[PDB]
């Protein structure tokens, strides 16, 4: 299928900084990617709850079957 979304598996439970628009996620959580490249080693995603924020690429692993 064309235009199918990208998913990630969290490797370690992350905690967002106050005022940084960071996404607090849990280890082993599933989220979709909204921005895989934003600068400084970061990315953006969306969870089960539908919330967005910044996440480090060093903390989450990108899943296969992306299209």
């Amino acid at each position: 299928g064309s235009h199918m979304a990208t998913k990630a598996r969290v490797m370690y439970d992350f905690a967002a900084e106050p005022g940084n628009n960071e996404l607090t996620v849990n280890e082993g959580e599933i989220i979709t990617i909204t921005n895989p490249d934003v600068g400084g080693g970061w990315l953006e995603g969306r969870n089960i709850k539908g919330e967005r924020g910044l996440v480090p690429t060093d903390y989450v692993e990108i899943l296969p079957s992306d299209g």
Binding site: N20, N21, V38, G40, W42, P56, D58
Partner: protein, 48 residues
């Protein structure tokens, strides 16, 4: 209507991973100014 996010800090280091500078903050800068006027006057000696 959404837009991309721009990080306030460089990406932090994950657990178990090899050493790098990462999101570490710098040490506190040098101290400057104090009770400079009348310093020696206040510190002045006395005996009984």
């Amino acid at each position: 209507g959404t837009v991309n996010f721009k990080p306030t800090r460089p990406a932090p280091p994950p657990p178990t991973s090899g050493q790098a500078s990462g999101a570490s903050r710098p040490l506190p800068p040098i101290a400057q100014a104090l009770k400079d006027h009348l310093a020696a006057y206040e510190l002045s000696k006395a005996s009984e």
